Every structure is written in C-alpha cells, then in structure tokens.
Amino acid sequence: AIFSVYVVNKAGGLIYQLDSYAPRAEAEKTFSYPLDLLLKLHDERVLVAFGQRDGIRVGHAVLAINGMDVNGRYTADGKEVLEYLGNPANYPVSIRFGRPRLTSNEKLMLASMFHSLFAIGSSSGIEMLETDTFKLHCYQTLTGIKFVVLADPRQAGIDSLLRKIYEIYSDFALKNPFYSLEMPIRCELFDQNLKLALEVAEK
Amino acid sequence: AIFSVYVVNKAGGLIYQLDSYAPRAEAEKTFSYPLDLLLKLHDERVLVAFGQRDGIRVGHAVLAINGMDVNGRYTADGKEVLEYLGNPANYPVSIRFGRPRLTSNEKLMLASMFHSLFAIGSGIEMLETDTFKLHCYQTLTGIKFVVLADPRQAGIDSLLRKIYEIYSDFALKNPFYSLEMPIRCELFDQNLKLALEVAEKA
Amino acid sequence: AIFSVYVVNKAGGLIYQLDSYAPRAEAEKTFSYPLDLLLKLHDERVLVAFGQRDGIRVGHAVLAINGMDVNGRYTADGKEVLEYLGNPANYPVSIRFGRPRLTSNEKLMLASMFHSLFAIGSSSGIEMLETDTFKLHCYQTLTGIKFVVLADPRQAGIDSLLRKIYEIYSDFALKNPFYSLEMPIRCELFDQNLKLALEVAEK
Amino acid sequence: AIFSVYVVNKAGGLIYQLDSYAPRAEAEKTFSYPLDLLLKLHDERVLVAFGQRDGIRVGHAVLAINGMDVNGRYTADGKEVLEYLGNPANYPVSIRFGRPRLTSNEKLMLASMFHSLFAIGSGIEMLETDTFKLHCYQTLTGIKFVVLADPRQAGIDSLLRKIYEIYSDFALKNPFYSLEMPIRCELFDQNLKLALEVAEKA
Amino acid sequence: AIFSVYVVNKAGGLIYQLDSYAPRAEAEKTFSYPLDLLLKLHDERVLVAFGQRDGIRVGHAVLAINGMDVNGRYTADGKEVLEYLGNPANYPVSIRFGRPRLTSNEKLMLASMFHSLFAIGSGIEMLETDTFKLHCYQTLTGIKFVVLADPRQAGIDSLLRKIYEIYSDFALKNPFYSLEMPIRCELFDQNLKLALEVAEKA
Amino acid sequence: AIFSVYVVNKAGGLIYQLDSYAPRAEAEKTFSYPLDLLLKLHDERVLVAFGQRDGIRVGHAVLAINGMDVNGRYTADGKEVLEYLGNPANYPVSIRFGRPRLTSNEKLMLASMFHSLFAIGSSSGIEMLETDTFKLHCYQTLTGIKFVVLADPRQAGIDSLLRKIYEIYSDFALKNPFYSLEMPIRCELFDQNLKLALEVAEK
C-alpha cells in the first residue's frame, strides 16, 4: 500500500499533499480508570505521552472512543477528549489508538533529511528511509523540487511513480502559464492524473 | 513535428488540450553485432552517443527493438536494453531511432518561459529553444491558442488562424459559456483534430 | 538589421547597453485638433495611451513635431510637448510616431523571462522570443551572465555573434584585473571589438 | 558487499570502527587489442563507459592490470592507464573489473543523510541510495550500531543483532566505561570480526 | 606554448597586449574509416573523447581537415564535421589534432583569479590551473607584465625580465607619458615581439 | 616542506587549521639604537612597518630578542616589546626577524582568490598561487569545501595529499553523525589521520 504523496518546492514549501491510506488504526480496547497512561495534545492530536501498557506505545494517537470517532482533539459529541478521559463519570471506556498520520511539519521535517548536501544541479535522484512500518522515497529534480512518497517497505514501482508525478507536474506547469513554481498545486486535472498514476502503481 | 495543441484562458489556466507527445520513428537500420553504435542511459532514455552513420544522428533515442515497443530502459519483454545487446545468443537485431519522447525538464523549461511571457505581457508570439518552439496566438479577449512544436515545423501560423476560426464559431454559438470552465464540445474537438491533420500534412 | 545589444550580470544588473538602430520611425502626419488621441508621459517618453486612429496604435511614441524632433518629453524649442499639443494656438500640427526604443527597465524585464528556471550551471544556452517586428536572443553563460541581442526576425548569425561577445567579454576581464563582474563595462577596446563583431554579423 | 561496521555513541561521535572499503574484483577477462572496451577518467578512477560485454558492466572500474595492483590512474609500475593501452609494444593484457573504491562525495552524501537522521530523530532504520544502504540499530541507551553496505547485501539484520549481543556482553563486563571514550577491547574486536565473517558468507 | 603577453597599469587597466591564441597542431595522422577515433561536440569544438592512439590524446580538438582550416563545428567548405565523417562518398581523410583554442570560460576563470590577486594584493607571482599558468611581474611603480601560458612552458622568467628591460627603456625615453594611456610605440612593439620569439624557441 | 594545512567551509568559515612548519626564522642581528626601523603591532604581531635596513624588509616580524623569544607582542620577560625597543636603557639589542605565520584572516583572504567565479558544482578542482617562497594549493570539492595547503614551490604530491584530506574528511563526517559541515573539526582520529597523510606526502 501507498500511505501518502507530497511535493515540496525548492524553498522547502509544501506545495501539494495527498494522504492515500488514512484509517491506519488497530482495535478498540477497554481500560479500567484511573487511566494508566499520560496523554498530551500535540498539534491538534491526542498522543500517548507516557506509559507502555500491553500493546500501546508512546506516540500512539487516540482515534475513537466507544464509537465516537475522535475529531482531532474533540469527540463526535463535540466534547473535549482530555477532559472526557479525565472525567470521573465515564471511567470504564473503550479507546482506539494507532500510529497517527504525518503532520505537514512532519512531512517537511522528514523531507529535509534528503538531498540536503549536493547543490541544485549536481543517476536517479532518489533517496530513501526504510523502517519496519514504512518506506519513504524522495526524488529531487534538476531544479530542487522534491517529490515524496510514503509506502509499506516492500511496495514496488515507486521509482517509476515518482518520475510520473514529475511528468504530470511539468505538463501541468506547461499548460497553465498562470502557475508559478512556489505556488500550491490546485488543479482538478492534476488530482485526476495523480490518482490514476497511483492506481497504476498500486497494481 | 507538433507535440501539443492547447487553449489557455485569460487567467492563464488550461481550458482545452490535445497531446501527441509520442514521436514517429525517423530512422530504421538492421544491425549485425558487434554493434556499430554506442549507447548510454540518460534519464531512463537510451540515447545514441557516438557514430552518426548514414541515417541516424548522435542524440537520437532507441525507440523500438525489432518492431516491438520499448518503454524506459526495458524491452517489450522486460529485459534491460544494454544487458541484451552484447548478447552471445542474441545479436542480429533491427532498431528504430528518432527524437526521444518529451521530457519533464524540457516541459518545465518551456513552462518557465511561457509563464514568464504570461506575467511580463503588457499578434502571434513565439518562444524558441534548440529543440522546441512554442507558438502563442492571443485574442482581444485574452484567449490564448498555443501550439508546441520543433523549431522547423512549418504552417503553424495557418494552424493557429484556423483554431481561432473554430473557437470563434464555438464562442458565437455558446455566448454564455464560463471562460474558467474547460471546453466540452465534440464539434470543437472534431474540427481542431482535422485542422491539426492539415498542418501535419503540410 | 540588429536593433540593440545588452549585457546583464548574474544579479540582474544591466552592465552594458548599445542601441544600434535608433531612428525606427514611420512618417509625419497631419491631425485636425482637438487631438483624437490620449497621450501619457511614461519614463521620459510621450506615448499614445488611448485611441487607434488610422495607422496609430496605443504604445506608439511621439518622435518629432513639424520638424522639431522630440527630445523625450521636450520639443526642439525646449517647450513641453503635453502642454504644446494641448496648446490651442498650434492646433493644426504634424506629428511623427513610431515604436519607441526599449527603456533599460524594459530590457531587464524582457531578459528576466529567459533562463529563469535552471540553476546557474545546469547545449547552446540560447533562448528566444520572436514576434512580427523583432526577434530577441538571450545567451546565458556558465556563470549566469546574460548576453541579449534584438534583431529583425530573419537575421542570421546571432548565435555566433552572442558567442563572440562573450569571447570579447572574457578577454576584457582577463586583460583588465581591476574589472569585477558586477561592474558596468566602460572600455574603449570593448566598444571597438563589439562594433566590429556587429559589423561582421550584419553582413 | 559490506563496506564498514561502526558503533556511534548517543552524542553522535565514533566509538568503534571496522573498515573494508577495498573491493573484490567481480569480472576478469583477457583482452586482445584493439581493446573492445572504452574507458574514461572520472575523479582519478578509470571507469568503463561503453560496451557491456559478457561479464563486465558499464560503470565498473579498472581494478587491476594483469594481476598487479593499480592505484588512482597509474599502474603498479607508474605509467598512465590510458597512455599504456593503445601501445604498439604492449597490447595483450588481462584486466580485473568491479565496483570502484568508495569515494569522498559518496561518503559525504551518506554522511549528510545519516547526520540528518541523527538530528531529526525523535528498531532498525535504513538509509538507501542507488549504490548504498546504511543500516542503523539504535539501543534504548542510544548506542547506534551502523553497517554500510550495497543495496543488495542480505543478512545485515542478523549481523546487527549480533553486534548488539556482543556490545551487551562488553557493557555488562565493563559497566563503568566512559561512553564518550572509544571501545578498546580485544575480545570485542575479535567477536565483531567473526560476526562480520558470518554475514559475508551468508 | 605562450598564449598572450600583456602589460597592465597600476590601476588594473590594459595598456598593451600581444595575442597568440591560435594554437599549432600537435599531431597529424591519416585515417582509413571506419574512423578509429570517437568525437563529440563541446561548446562548438570537436574534441576527441576516446581512443588515445599513438600520437593523439583524449582531450585534443580537431583543428584541421586534410590541410584546410575549420572553424567552430563546420569545415572550410561549410558542412558539419560529424555529418561528413561517416560518409559513404567521403572516407579517406587526414586530420590535425592538438590543444583547442582558448575558451571564454577558461579566460573568465583566469580573469577571476587575476582580479582577485590584484585586489587582495598587499617579485614574480604565478597563478596556475591544470591547463594554464599566468605569470605576473610587478614593478615598484605598479606596472604589471603578464604572460599567459600552459603549465609547462619554460623561460617565462627570462621573458618577463626582458619585457621589464624594454619597458624601462621606453619609460626613460618617454618620462612624461600618461600611465592610464595605452603604449603606442613601434620600437616597444618591435622589441617585445623579438623577446617573445626567443622565449618561444627556448 | 609543507608549511600549513587548512580547511574552509562553503560559507567561508575556517573549519580546521594546522601550522606544520613554524620556526621559519633567519638569524639574530645587532642594531645600534636609536632603531632605524619603524615597527607596528598588527594582529598581535610586531611587524616592520618602514625601513629596509641591510637584510630586513617591511612585513618582517620580530620573533625573539636577545634570547627572550617574542610571545607575540610580549617578551619572555612579560614586558611589552614596543616600549622595550623604545626603552633607552636597552639600546644595544639583538633581534630575530623572519616572515611571520599567516593569520587566520590572511588564510581566509588568500583562500578567497580561488574558485571565486564558477558556481558550486560546475577536471581536478585545484587552483594555485606560486611565489619564490611558497606555493599555495586550493582544492574545491563538489559542495564548496576548500582544502588549502601551503608548501615550498617544488614540493611534490600536494594534489594527492589534498584528495586524501578530503577522503579523511568525508569518512570523519560519515562516522560522526553529530558533525555538521559548518562546524569546526575537533576530533583526535582526524588529527591522527591527517598528520600521517602529511608524513606520507613529505617523503
């Protein structure tokens, strides 16, 4: 599977992002409160700050409660989650935690580790970081544009996909003279052509 | 050759396009290896580096292998071009050569010229490089008809005047048409295709 | 014919300019005032702002009146032109308009459309803009210097000319160690060598 | 192939290294000149540019000349590689080919990735390029075991788990050892060398 | 070889020059095609890429074609070098090779060193590259005699001492001569030319 | 002999310096005062400002007095040198002058004359300045790092040495992920590997 696609301009500005796979959860689990975990709101998301209870790591996010899917730091009831799990009344609860989606800042931070050395215009232009849970591919073009793709470790075709996104990008620029390279990409035909290129690459 | 015909609106956004980026083969010669032509990988294109023999030219790309379509650096089957030509089992082979498919960098380079023209803009105007020539006809109303071609293609002038006529016919028949919206019109598509055929025969 | 030659440094500074052809006029025409054209002073030049009378476009400049050649925004009589053509007394007049010479800002603006993308040091280095009335050739060197030449559409040799100017430029730099690359070129032998290179290219 | 095994401390400083940058020859073919292989100088390395004949590959470097070790661009004797192959007196010669020795730029490129990983860092993690793959195992205590290899080398995973075991044995026996100080320990050196041998046979 | 002799005034402006940028041919070999030498266009110079045969060297440029002078990438007649060597009608041809004419980039590179020397400056001093060596003798009065040469040219030291003697003779005989003005003096030109001849024979 | 080795980062920051040969003196000479030379303190060093007495040029530094080696602008007695040679009591003196070692600013200034033109990432990367008394070699890498070596005019091997320092540098960076390229190099194994590379190059 392919989790995410994003594009960074030569000045480190995020210019396009598409989260493909998003419901990367696990399972709803019951917990007898007082909760043996310490939670923090980080960038509109409720993360596990401390405690490694059976199954749960620090860095895990809360994704749902009892059915009420977590709308970031709010419940589906509109109520605030940190006061809700600190709420004595609803002590026996079911909570869904999984590895959260990357913030835009995180996407940038991750992108900044590739091609940091060689000047703009230095045989494939692809650098990568691989873990247990994902593989990140970063293609830098001649003029410093970075195309990044996040996918499970053993996903084939990413090299060709990245070149194709560039092909879609450069064609978009040529057909749309209003567009300047620092600008966010906001074009229907781009979205269409990318989603298709992803479909091809998935198979 | 003509690589693309497209229509850009006053605000600089695409409203109609017709692409023909896939080239036609220029040269076809049968080879009896040791291969009297030297090849190198260049951005996933197999280019001729040396040995401009009668027909082929230093800079042409390997388009087809004995008739079959090859994409990137691998054959129709799926073996690497270079790792299949110095082959003891396989040696006698015919190859098609010509201008490579249009690249991203090239597209980006032209985009960068065209965008600049659009912004500095204050008749037919043409942007040219060694390998490309972009022709732009702008109407009073700010509609731009663009033809992307190689430096030598003739009769674009007349092609552009035709697209103008066809667009005018479309605009007269569809006066209350959102200019930010793409042109969805069979007859338009039809007549533009026919107009391109004429220019391609020229 | 070749209309103009100029050189831009890697930082977008105009470093040399020579207007070759200059009397690009048309013919003196009589006009019964009140004048059916709206005129504006733009960058020391009297341009046609509005009105497209028989022969005259907007953007056309005033180049002479009755014989008194227009010294920019003044007449040969020292009198101001906008008050002179608004002057009731001299209502029946003869005026010469043609496409004005490029301002230095215009030269720069035009130069900024070429090689804007690829970084300094990215097979000929020549990019061009062609119209009915002129063709503009822009050569970018390894170190970002732009040599620009303005000439009628079907003028041959410009590619070779541009390389020669570079040859003259680089030799000038080598013989003149005081010279630094951001500086305006002010050298007699340069002017001599260029005017000669133009002469060769014209033929 | 495995190019380097090293141990980095929590603060990011080197505390142990074992280098094996000198490659083993991949291909060996005897040539009867006119030489059916084209060579170019590239940062004081003689690389094969064209003619991927059965065995050798476009990109391999000339490692040895008829058995003897050649350094940079000069022979074991001291004559220039290129100025000795088109030789009327000397023509029949055997040559060894394979991956060139690791370059500075390459090292610097990986360093730039590794440093960035170290700084952004907030399991085994791997950094990869076309020609390199760096494997990094970080302990709870922040000790990093790093193996530098080509993209295809297998069994680094197990090698890294072994170095972890050997380092753990060392740390248990030497609990009050300055972590800023290099590891000076024969048995450590011994066991790591043996562990690398296993991974190299794999 | 000596490419240029010139005199720079205290303020860093040119006051006298004598150029000899056009090279002499180093090697001349008759060829019987298929041509046993591979050529590439490089900034409008035809350079030898591969095949350093007895005489010629990888990096030399094609200077002349069967005796006649060729400029840029076209022959004395006006046909393209490459598009005339793989010719079925034309094959047997002799070619002259050697150091290419001095380029703009090279000139600019040296200029950038020389200018820097001039500005940082606070005896004979020499600036050197792989292919160039610039020799600069500065007088008490700040007059600079400069000789541009390749790294191996000998006896520039003595040539520079001679130009100093000749300039001194000129300055003694013309004491009230504007140092911002170019040197217009037949005898000066004469004696410097003779001095260069001696250094060129050396 | 090799006098000095230093390394400059791509932003013109001095990142490592090692003065190899240092006691580059001449001989102690007697002078009957009032001293016929004018001396100035420049950057913690006592230089000859004016006067060219038999043997001594302007630019020569004072390196010792009567045995008391000059600790920059102080004597081995702790006393200030400019007041000491202007001191009437000790008028008959012996003074040692020779060409001073390069200040860090001088090292930078000298380095700034090489590779100033071509952009970062433009066949050996070595540029040099040669005089009677020294030859300076400057190697610029792909990413703008300058390695500089100062040595007597006819010293062989410098090209290979410079490449080796780069090899040592790049390896140091790879083994030390804390290190960032703008930082001063402060590592024992680096010093060891360099001093060895110098030893090889000397022979």
From Swiss-Prot, chains A, C, F:
SMART domains: Sybindin. Pfam families: Sybindin (PF04099). GO terms for cellular component: cytoplasm; cytosol; dendrite; endoplasmic reticulum; Golgi membrane; Golgi stack; postsynaptic density membrane; presynaptic active zone. Keywords: Cell membrane, Endoplasmic reticulum, ER-Golgi transport, Golgi apparatus, Membrane, Postsynaptic cell membrane, Synapse, Transport. Core component of the TRAPP complexes which has a function of guanine nucleotide exchange factor activity for Rab1 GTPase. Plays a role in vesicular transport from endoplasmic reticulum to Golgi and autophagy. May play a role in dendrite postsynaptic membrane trafficking. Component of the multisubunit TRAPP (transport protein particle) complex, which includes at least TRAPPC2, TRAPPC2L, TRAPPC3, TRAPPC3L, TRAPPC4, TRAPPC5, TRAPPC8, TRAPPC9, TRAPPC10, TRAPPC11 and TRAPPC12. Interacts with SDC2. Belongs to the TRAPP small subunits family. TRAPPC4 subfamily. It is linked to Neurodevelopmental disorder with epilepsy, spasticity, and brain atrophy: An autosomal recessive disorder characterized by severely impaired global development apparent soon after birth, early-onset seizures, lack of psychomotor development, spastic quadriparesis, progressive cortical and cerebellar atrophy, and dysmorphic features, including microcephaly. Death in childhood may occur. This is Trafficking protein particle complex subunit 4.
From Swiss-Prot, chains B, D, E:
SUPFAM superfamilies: SNARE-like (SSF64356). It is found in: Postsynaptic cell membrane; Golgi apparatus membrane; Endoplasmic reticulum; Vesicle. GO terms for cellular component: cytoplasm; cytosol; dendrite; endoplasmic reticulum; Golgi membrane; Golgi stack; postsynaptic density membrane; presynaptic active zone. Gene3D superfamilies: 3.30.450.70. It comes from the Eukaryota. InterPro entries: Longin-like_dom_sf (IPR011012), TRAPPC (IPR007233). Keywords: Cell membrane, Endoplasmic reticulum, ER-Golgi transport, Golgi apparatus, Membrane, Postsynaptic cell membrane, Synapse, Transport. Pfam families: Sybindin. One of its GO terms (biological process) is dendrite development. Component of the multisubunit TRAPP (transport protein particle) complex, which includes at least TRAPPC2, TRAPPC2L, TRAPPC3, TRAPPC3L, TRAPPC4, TRAPPC5, TRAPPC8, TRAPPC9, TRAPPC10, TRAPPC11 and TRAPPC12. Interacts with SDC2. PANTHER family: TRAFFICKING PROTEIN PARTICLE COMPLEX SUBUNIT, TRAFFICKING PROTEIN PARTICLE COMPLEX SUBUNIT 4. Core component of the TRAPP complexes which has a function of guanine nucleotide exchange factor activity for Rab1 GTPase. Plays a role in vesicular transport from endoplasmic reticulum to Golgi and autophagy. May play a role in dendrite postsynaptic membrane trafficking. Belongs to the TRAPP small subunits family. TRAPPC4 subfamily. It is linked to Neurodevelopmental disorder with epilepsy, spasticity, and brain atrophy: An autosomal recessive disorder characterized by severely impaired global development apparent soon after birth, early-onset seizures, lack of psychomotor development, spastic quadriparesis, progressive cortical and cerebellar atrophy, and dysmorphic features, including microcephaly. Death in childhood may occur. This is Trafficking protein particle complex subunit 4. The lineage of its organism: Eukaryota, Metazoa, Chordata, Craniata, Vertebrata. The gene is TRAPPC4.
